[PDB]
Amino acid sequence: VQGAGQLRLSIDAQDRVLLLHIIEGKGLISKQPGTCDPYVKISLIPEDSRLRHQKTQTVPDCRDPAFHEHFFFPVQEEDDQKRLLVTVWNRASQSRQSGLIGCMSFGVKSLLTEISGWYYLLGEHLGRTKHLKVARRR
């Protein structure tokens, strides 16, 4: 699964404080059998800690979820070489069973020097290395 769907988001930086707006998702593809109950988790990588992780609500049984949630992710100089990871998960009753639908990432330093629109959900490996916007072709 190369393209697991699309996510609409916005990212703006304000004095070393990342403002993320996770709007909605579309055409989500989950290889797990059953309902699609997605949520979005934001974090930085690589980082051996989850204290900074943040997530949206879980939208039950929907392949085109409307999140409409804003996040404030503060970053510091020491985070410049990390990447902001945005991951869509398919919730399971027990966390360890939750499957990864797709992900994408943005370099932290590059975000401090604006993102907005639809982006593709990439694979568990590829998504940690880049992001790909959905062309507007306007």
Binding site for its own copies (CB under 8 A): 41, 45-52, 78-79, 87, 89, 95-100, 124-125, 128-129
Cβ at position 128, least distance to its own copies in Å: 6
Buried-state track 115-135, b at ≥16 Cβ within 10 A, e below 16: beebbbbbeeebbbeebeeee
CB of 81 to its own copies, least distance (A): 9
Shortest reach from residue 91's CB to its own copies, in Å: 9
Please, which residue, 24 or 124, has the CB nearer to its own copies?
Answer: 124
- Residue 20 or residue 101: which is nearer to its own copies going by CB? 101
8/55 with CB nearer its own copies: 55
With b for 16 or more beta-carbon neighbours within 10 A and e for fewer, the 22-59 pattern comes to bbbbeebebeeeeebbbbbbbbbeeeeeeeeeebbebb
